[PDB]
Amino acid sequence: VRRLLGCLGSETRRLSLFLVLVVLSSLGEMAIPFFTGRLTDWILQDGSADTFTRNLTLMSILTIASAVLEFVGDGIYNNTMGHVHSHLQGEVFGAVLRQETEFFQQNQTGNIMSRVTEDTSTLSDSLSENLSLFLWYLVRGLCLLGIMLWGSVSLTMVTLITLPLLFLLPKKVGKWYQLLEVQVRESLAKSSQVAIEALSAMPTVRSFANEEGEAQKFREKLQEIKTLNQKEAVAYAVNSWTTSISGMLLKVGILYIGGQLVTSGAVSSGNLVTFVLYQMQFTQAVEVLLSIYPRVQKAVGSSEKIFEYLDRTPRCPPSGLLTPLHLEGLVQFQDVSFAYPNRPDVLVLQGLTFTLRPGEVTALVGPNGSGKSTVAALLQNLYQPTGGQLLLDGKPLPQYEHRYLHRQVAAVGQEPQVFGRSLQENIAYGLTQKPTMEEITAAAVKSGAHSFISGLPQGYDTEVDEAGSQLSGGQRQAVALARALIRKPCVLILDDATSALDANSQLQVEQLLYESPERYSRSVLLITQHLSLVEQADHILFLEGGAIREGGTHQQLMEKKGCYWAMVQA
């Protein structure tokens, strides 16, 4: 379509040079038969030898130049094709990565977007060379037609007239063979189906000892397909015979009409020899074009799939432009109600309203489910609220710049992922500026991960494989905490970061939450199952069914004697 020309237009300076080289090489590669005919005619006229050596040198020079020009043009085309293929791959990946989280939560189809991009590889090659093979040949054919027409218009007119009669008749004949093949395939499928049906009930076919019956019923099916096979063979034989004789008789016809022309005196024998040598190459070029065309047709037909991912509209608000240099970190919820866009019939959150202020720790507690992690997912702008408002320092989340907002708010999830790279890169993941070693050591000390980092033989540069199989759960929790603590965030979410951790890590977290000197510039939302950390929190929020029922400090909730009291007693 027009999109291929649009993405190929950035190089229409090199493509013109490639086309010029191609036409020059095609012109120069055909001097061999012409000079053969000329030199043979000169021998028959017993001429001189200076013209002989001159013509030999000229033909050699022309052929050498043709080969060199073909090589140079092929190199230029390959270089440009590789460049545009790399650009297209980068563009399609960048377009895929911009879609909203609702597109990516279908992890059961995750490999699809791990495959479609790779499809853009195997498609592009299927279009990279075939389009060359077409383009390298058609002009070549057009070159040959430019010489035989100069030789004698009658013979080239004859071969042009009878070319379709030899290159379309087998196509018309092959329909019979193809339909017979389809019938044979369907009969074989039916026989295989009845064989599978017989085989799937082995206990009940052995209980009556009827294996001979199944053998007979399977032979009976093949006895019918034998006749279809015979008809298939006859049709194939007829197709082969016609596709042979139609192409073979053209040479005899050309020789007859050329002999008539030569006896008439219009042309000489050398022209006939050159025409005979040119006709085979012309036929080969035409056959190559006919073979090439369906493949490029299939490629351009299948190219429409990639553009679907390329221009898919994201269902998410655009990034804002706000980037203040001073954030207090106050977070307000105003009657927030959220339903998952995958199944928007269920309201997971309803009537949520609370305020987080710097220097104060808010502990969110509740049973399994009940949208505990959904509030954390909403807080870091991973989803948009169906109803209500989320306010950060008096401004909504989408109004902020994407990178700045995600730098100012940090979260530790239930199951932290660790990518495969150096260990000190995982600590500073996503940072715009590479931090110093002192900052990474300070972050490791704050999270307590520095105890076992120095025990590694490679230190902070220990490579990690995929999925973090080289580390235990507690080490992964420590590295995730240190990664979330490196940027000094304004709003810290710790959701299930105290589940499978060491006691030393628990002590480090407890010290960071309450007795750390830098807590005053931080607002913490803590989700945990340990009552010791919960009791020291300033505000406690109980979540059940996506609604807030019990709220206040620990003493007030103890005096309430409600759900939190039962949880404490349990």
Add this chain to the structure above:
Amino acid sequence: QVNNKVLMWRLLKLSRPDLPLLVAAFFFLVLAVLGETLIPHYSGRVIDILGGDFDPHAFASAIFFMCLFSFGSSLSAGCRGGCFTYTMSRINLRIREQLFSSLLRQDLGFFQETKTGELNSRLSSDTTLMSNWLPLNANVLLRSLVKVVGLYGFMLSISPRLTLLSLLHMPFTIAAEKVYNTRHQEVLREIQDAVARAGQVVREAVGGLQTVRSFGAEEHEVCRYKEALEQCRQLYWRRDLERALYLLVRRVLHLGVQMLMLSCGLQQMQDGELTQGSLLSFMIYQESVGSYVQTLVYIYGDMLSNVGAAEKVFSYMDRQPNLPSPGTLAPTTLQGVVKFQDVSFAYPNRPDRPVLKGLTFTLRPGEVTALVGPNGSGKSTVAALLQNLYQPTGGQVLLDEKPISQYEHCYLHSQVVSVGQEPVLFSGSVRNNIAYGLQSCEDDKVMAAAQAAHADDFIQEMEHGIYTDVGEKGSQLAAGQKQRLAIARALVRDPRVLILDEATSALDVQCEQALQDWNSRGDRTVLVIAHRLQTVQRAHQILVLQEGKLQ
């Protein structure tokens, strides 16, 4: 690597009974090649005739011979193609039938272990590849060899000096091809490694997207992907440059040999030992000869590469069944005394986990023996062991003071029959499924069996009576109708030992019991399986089986 050699020997032995077709196809191929290769020689003769003084008779004769040879070559080519396609189809049919017949004799454990889809894939796909393997490769090899021999014979006929000049070309081409392939293999390995490394980053980024979006590191992954794509593109360009250089050197060599041959031929024609038509025919032959010798030198690898799609089916045919040798006891004295002595069974698919713990009981001809127990106790296993579908791991079974495995396979199942727990129906008609496993029968016996099983009430509602067609896997009748049909199918044979694994049945088996005491006739041993003790209560002998132990 002798596995491929023995596989190809097996394929040749399988295709052995198609000798005349292959011989005729080879003869037609030789005729077609010989007829085709004469065309440029007669073209050269015509060209030589046209020069100099004219002679219409020679011209007409040459054109007539050209037409005749073209007609003969086309006819032979068509016949060869037809013969090869027919032998393809014959090989396919023979191998399909052989595989099915071999698979039909396996033990039950093999079918329990394997899957129906895998068997369908092996039967319906690999046989076509086996059929296509031999005649296609044979045609290619024979065509290449005959073409090479004929073309070089014609070179020798025209002029030997130019033939030697042409033959001087090959070794440089062979060496260049080998060197290019050796470098290309390493380049391809590097390409594969680089593309795997490039795909790793996109897989990792698309996996954990929530953590990526949490930290806003979306453009970083794009930059890393671009960095990987740069190395991939560099390796691609290096590979393309190597290929272009190889093509250039091949073209230069071909040009050199062509120019040398043309110069030598012109020098020879100047001396008077050649003619214009002979030179033209020699050029045509020289153009034609190269691809055939290339195919000839690559055909061994091409043929050996495709054999690796037929070893699975040969292994399936070569699998040894785990069954005892059949007996040869077919007596007419089969009053129906059945004994189980210390029978303990373990499933071969899941060994060392026995379900039977030393059963021992006796059956009687005229009386009724019922077996009761809870779900999962394993009464169906007792029925299967009584039907000689499995062998006991301990103790023995006796049928009229003879082991059951020493009876004839066809005779035993005509006397000891069983209505199964879940009846299975086939795609045949009602009459075909009622008389399943029977070579011949009469309509009266089928009608009597339908009346005895209380299945004749609904047998007249459908068209054509008992000859009514049934859907695939019996997907046309109700569950009660299927149960009645199965009961009639069992009762057709008029057995002596009758097992009725009712268990989960909804045919109001109270009617079956009220029919005639669970089909007991006083000379036929009956073993009826029931879920609850209260459902039968009239059996002369009652056995309760708990956890593989009798009570």
